[PDB]
């Protein structure tokens, strides 16, 4: 089992007993340990681990914040053993619990913040107990802070009354153990005379929790409330003994103190934070914690003047509120961030600095050096390409070498790093640098020598420069090197130099001193992995971290044999995440391993690990060490290495030398003497044969003929591979409309072959499965309209072509048998939208495959189905369809009734008219049925169209045993329908839907909007391409870096005409957004000036301008960042929110110009309350049909001023100019399936291209545009610009585009052409 | 050191390795920085190379394919007002003229008076200021 | 059976021409001392530097090879890592300092260190090189 095993362990790790969760933690290691096989089974046998794996990560990173040191190096050695799965593999949206979020974001008298005082001050009581000094304070605080409030359990409801509630009364059992029992309070006090008056830093404040004691009593002094003094006095004296409260009081002292007081106290407080903040460590503690219980009283200022303004939009409130505000207003932006980056807080340096050049006009470029410095630090390379591309003046030298850095070129920054090593000589990072990047480049002799020469002209630098002598001599294998390196220094703890020390104890066999080594090493490892993992997409950010646990996992198992290994290395080196960064210190700790312990094969393993590095470097980009790499692998793999270097040929473009180096190495390794029938020989052989083969289609020379013969001859070498029958079929089709003269008469039995290819490539992999499937049902299915069409005509081909169809229906049927279900489930809809074919052998093939997806997921295909099956001739075909889907299997029966029932129900609740005018309607009283119905115990459970459920997964290319066959798509929790929750709310916003909310059978509540008066057949298929975008951005290495992601919800049609749509919770329209913000500050334009602004489509471009510019943008400041500075008030947060809408902004910007989406107006872009990623809806308007309106929409997508406001001060630049470029590469890499996909949607007889005519035949309606929009779609996707308009150019490149882009969606001209419902003004 | 030749030279390298759109970014902020519009370049080489850089931005644009003619034109005949004893400025006009006159004219050469007499004026002056371009503009 | 003495003829004559025809000849694997005739006859020097650093970790003691990598590194322009790159060489042998001379004297009067390079060049009587010769004019 292990499944259950794996249950168990996640939960008994999650014990409050430390000793327990100890125990777990030892049993789950070793259960991982014993169990690898099955684990690597799951997390490789689909693109997606299985649920329990992403379940079992999560656990581990939260256990590992757990504050005893044991379980944190448990888990540790935990995930190190589980893997580095790659991030895009594990799904960690389960986990968006609320945590750090819990509640009393704002208080200030409330017993709320009572009994959080009364609690610290039970934390306090039994800290009392410690040594009875503490004692004497502790006893009469609680005391007085029980006689202040209520204290007791009247049975009247009475404030206190529910605060003992509010205790978990064992503390609330503390309080009325001495409830009036007066522990001979000190009653003393030092009154502030002559007391030093810059307090931090100096007499009694000269630590932190003196300083803060002082500071709070002098504000104690100051505040003249009559209910707050009296608290303050309470804890007077135990803010001596306790740190922890003076910094839970100090933020309300500072808020009562400056609601109104003499203007010297607040100059007082002014100066001493002044001070604080100012005031630089080394220029111990004490600065630290001191500026942040200065950030600490600040946030709660800025929190409580928010609070205040809105009770008071909702006298002495304004005056207080004003004073408050006034004294945040002193403080200068600039000193806060400033002092924020000295803390290392960077998100609230950043924070800090965004608002003091907005809030106080500045100009970015007189302080772009600081902001480079903050995103640097950050690791923010998008940050530092921003800056890099706002400045105009000329980058120094100091701001290039960062640049360089950060982005991660390392030719152009070793250059640099020479040219200042030059300018400034005894600097010691350019030296570093140099180091570096040599080390970088596999030019490890020269940097053993760099270092020694250093080392002869000035030797202290070799101390710090010891890691690269020590990384380099563990990588030649020099172990005497190591060693003497190691032995001169010890002060270094660098990773290198920790692995050097773990490979040369390993090298001695010294067993006692390589396990406390490795103790030490994975503690220190798991140390970044505790501050990580207190966030959101916590994995991905300490990925390098995990990969360390991942190496240190595998060099243990790999010599504990050497001191007295099941690891499956290719498995674990194929989970990684497919980066540079990612494999190759893996694969180079491998290297060391195998020279470590030296078996027969070792000259061979070694070579096959380089190979790995030059194959993992070339695709990243690092030609230079993918040369080194194969330079390296030396031989024992001759057949191999020649693949590798005609790849890294290929992709430097140099398409001739890579086909003239690959046919030498297939000559020479597989000579025409022998045939190669030597297994791995054999698929190597194969490998060759197909590179050699796609490299002659590209070159122009070659005839059609000899490629296809290649192409035939791999396909006969290995008969069981996919891609030698994908590339031969997909190459038959693209020679098929020029042989044919494009005419499918002829086109017959090139179709059926290509078709029999197609499926016998999907028999052995899925791999292609989005171009093959697609394709193949295309060319049969409108082979066989064609077929019926002559046969209507009379022509005498048309018999031949009866022929050629009846024989592709076979091969159709034969696929149909041997194909595995899920893989006709990805092309369902495509299926279910060809059910109206004219031709009927067509239809009964059709039929069957429709069938057997029906019967091996009859939930999925049911919900797909229900559209159709209540539209005439659809309804018939689909009855039919059904009709024998329950002859096969009668238990469907009962089901389908169930289902049919529960769909016109749900029905009639969209197109039930709403009596009169009220926002709820009951249920219980309104429909009464549609709640019998789901309430029978009869009633078959139906699943919840989640787009969870809806989606397949398709197992991965490792799986073997998995694919074709014993694969599960669907993974992961179904919840059915269980019933319905009573309430049903009723929209003024989307024209008068409903939004029931259905209770799952895990008893979690769906709201289902059910719009009406709309079809959303194009909305389905439209989700349907989005989630494939979403796995490719997942696989994407940089993607999921940056974390790019489409949001999708689920779209069900129920009807041509309804619909149910999954509601999307804690988002609001950018306009309603905006209009709430504009109504808070005041200034706001009711529909009357609009309407006076608004002038006719007949006016000249310039009066439009006028218009816009004079009056629309005056009125409409730029004011969206506010809406992240109020949602997400915490600064790390704010940080994460920011970059995610920057993030998803571009994804669905670029998205949307390659679909051609329009009607962007407010609504349809919501952004989230709690991610504040953007979601788009209403996906009817694509392919351009905007510039039909009549007023035509001419911006790419929406980029509105507001839009670049909320992204920050450095604007487009930064994050949504890189987002955008990454989601375009992604985009032009996967053209292919992708284009396949949206071929196949473009064509869909089923969406309603044209609106019905009035009066009132085939279902079928053919889209006459399709070819115009497949045309357009594919130009975009190359980089073609539709405005030549005189002008003939090469394909834009990626970054050209994006900035085309950019710059004609936020073009005040064609702005103010647009329709002002779009409201391009706010 | 003295050197808005520093941008035109970035700016020609970036396009040697194929990057032609950030050779345009970096040659418009260069020329930006170091001729400002506010004064004037009259002066010496610093017109020499402000006529150099004008030339070169224009050469980018028509490279590109988002920036349409109307612009291409005025970029190119600001280079020949700015250096008119320059060639290079008269033959790249006349070039692209060239180029854009069977598009506007729809290959009909009743209309391609106006320009061919545009154009043969601009070949002509190229030559009278250089030789450089002779067996490409003479024919 | 005898192209490697072929391409030795040909990059001893200066046939850039005859060395990439032997290159392209070959039916073999081509040789680590092969592929380095190749990158030193026609000009690349970091495919050229990649197998320089791989024959010094494969044959230590053949001074040819730092040769071959310090000649790169100032082909590059990299005249500081120039220097120290001959320090450290010279630090763990000194024999091959007096060889190496030539290269951090050339990156020594190229950085207009004049005071290196009259260190470099007092510790020198041997070399003839035009970059020696040159630094003793500059340094005149
Ligand atoms: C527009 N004309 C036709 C049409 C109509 C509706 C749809 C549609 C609706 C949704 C959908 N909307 C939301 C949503 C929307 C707005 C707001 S709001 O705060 O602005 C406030 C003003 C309501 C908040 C949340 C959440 N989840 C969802 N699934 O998806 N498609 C599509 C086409
Ligand atoms: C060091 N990395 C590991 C490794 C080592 C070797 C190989 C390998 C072998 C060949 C090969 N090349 C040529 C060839 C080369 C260059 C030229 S040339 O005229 O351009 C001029 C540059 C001389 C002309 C012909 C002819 N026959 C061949 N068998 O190609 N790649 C692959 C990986």
Known sequence: ?????????????????????????????????????????????????????????????????????????????????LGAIDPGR?????????????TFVTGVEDSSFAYGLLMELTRAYLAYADNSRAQDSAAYAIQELLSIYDCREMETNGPGH??????????????????????????????????????????????????????????????????????????????????????????????????????????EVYAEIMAVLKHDDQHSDLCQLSTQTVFSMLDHLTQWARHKFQALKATVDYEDYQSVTRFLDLIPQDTLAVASFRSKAYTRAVMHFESFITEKKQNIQEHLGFLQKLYAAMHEPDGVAGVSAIRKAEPSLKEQILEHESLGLLRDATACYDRAIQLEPDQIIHYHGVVKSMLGLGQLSTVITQVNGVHANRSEWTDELNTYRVEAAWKLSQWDLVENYLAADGKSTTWSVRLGQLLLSAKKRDITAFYDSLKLVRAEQIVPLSAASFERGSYQRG?????????????????????????????????????????????????????????????????????????????????????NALLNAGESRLAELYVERAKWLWSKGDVHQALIVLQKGVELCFPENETPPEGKNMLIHGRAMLLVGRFMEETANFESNAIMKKYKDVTACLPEWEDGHFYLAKYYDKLMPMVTDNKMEKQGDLIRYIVLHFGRSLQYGNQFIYQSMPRMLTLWLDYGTKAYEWEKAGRSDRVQMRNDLGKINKVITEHTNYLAPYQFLTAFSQLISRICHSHDEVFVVL??????????????????????????????????????????????????????????????????????????????????????????????????????????????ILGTHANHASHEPFPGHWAYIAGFDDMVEILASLQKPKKISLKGSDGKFYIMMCKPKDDLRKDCRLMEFNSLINKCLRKDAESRRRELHIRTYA???????????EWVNNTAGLRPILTKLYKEKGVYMTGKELRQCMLPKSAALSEKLKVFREFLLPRHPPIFHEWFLRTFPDPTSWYSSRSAYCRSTAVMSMVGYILGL???????????????????????????????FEVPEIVPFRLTHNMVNGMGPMGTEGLFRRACEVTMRLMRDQREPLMSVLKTFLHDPLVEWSKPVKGHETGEVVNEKAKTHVLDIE??????????????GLPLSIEGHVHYLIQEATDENLLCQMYLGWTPYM
């Open 1158 to 1188: 329009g009607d962007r107006h407010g609504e349809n872009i919501l952004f989230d309350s709690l991610t504040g990623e953007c979601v788009h809806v209403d996906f009817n308007c694509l392919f351009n049909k905007g510039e039909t």
């Open 1275 to 1288: 130009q975009r996707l190359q980089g073609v610009i539709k405005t030549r308009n005189r002008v003939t």
């Open 90 to 102: 594990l799904d960690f949206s389960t986990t968006e619990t609320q945590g750090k979020d819990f």
């Open 1 to 81: 089992d292990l499944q259950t095993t794996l249950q168990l362990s996640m939960k008994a790790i999650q014990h409050e007993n430390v000793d327990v969760r100890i125990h777990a933690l030892t049993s789950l290691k070793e259960t991982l340990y014993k169990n690898q096989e099955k684990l690597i089974k799951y997390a490789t046998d689909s693109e997606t681990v299985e649920p329990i794996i992403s379940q079992l990560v999560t656990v581990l990173l939260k256990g590992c914040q757990d504050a005893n040191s044991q379980a944190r190096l448990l888990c540790g050695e935990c995930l190190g053993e």
């Open 162 to 267: 529910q605060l003992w509630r509010r205790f978990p009364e064992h503390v609330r059992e503390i309080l009325e153990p001495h409830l009036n029992t007066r522990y001979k309070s000190s009653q003393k006090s030092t009154d502030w005379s002559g007391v030093k008056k810059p307090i931090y830093l100096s007499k009694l404040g000269s630590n932190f929790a003196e300083w803060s004691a002082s500071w709070a009593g002098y504000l104690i002094t100051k505040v003249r409330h009559d209910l707050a003094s009296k608290i303050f006095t309470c804890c007077s004296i135990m803010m001596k003994h306790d740190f922890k409260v003076t910094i839970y009081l100090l933020p309300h002292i500072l808020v009562y103190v400056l609601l109104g007081c003499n203007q010297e106290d607040q100059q």
């Open 543 to 627: 990925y390098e971290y995990i990969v360390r646990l991942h190496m240190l996992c595998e060099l243990e198992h790999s010599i504990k044999p050497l001191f007295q290994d099941s690891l499956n290395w290719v498995a674990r080196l194929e989970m990684t995440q497919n980066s540079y960064r990612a494999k190759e210190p893996i694969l180079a700790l491998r290297r060391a391993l195998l020279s470590l312990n030296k078996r027969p094969d070792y000259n061979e393993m070694v070579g096959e690990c380089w190979l790995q590095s030059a194959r993992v470097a070339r695709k990243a980009g690092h030609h230079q060490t993918a040369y």
């Open 1051 to 1061: 779209v069900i049609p129920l009807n041509d005409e309804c619909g149910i749509i």
């Open 847 to 956: 039929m069957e495959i429709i069938a057997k997806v029906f019967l091996a997921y009859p939930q999925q295909a049911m919900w797909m189905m229900t559209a159709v099956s209540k539209s005439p001739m659809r309804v018939n075909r689909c009855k039919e369809i059904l009709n024998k889907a329950i002859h096969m299997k009668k238990s469907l029966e009962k089901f389908v009734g169930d289902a049919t029932r529960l769909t016109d129900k749900l029905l009639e609740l969209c197109n039930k008219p709403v009596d009169g005018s009220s926002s709820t309607l009951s249920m219980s009283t309104h429909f009464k049925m549609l709640k019998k119905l789901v309430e029978e115990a009869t009633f078959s459970e139906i699943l919840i169209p989640l787009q969870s459920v809806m989606i397949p997964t398709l197992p991965s």
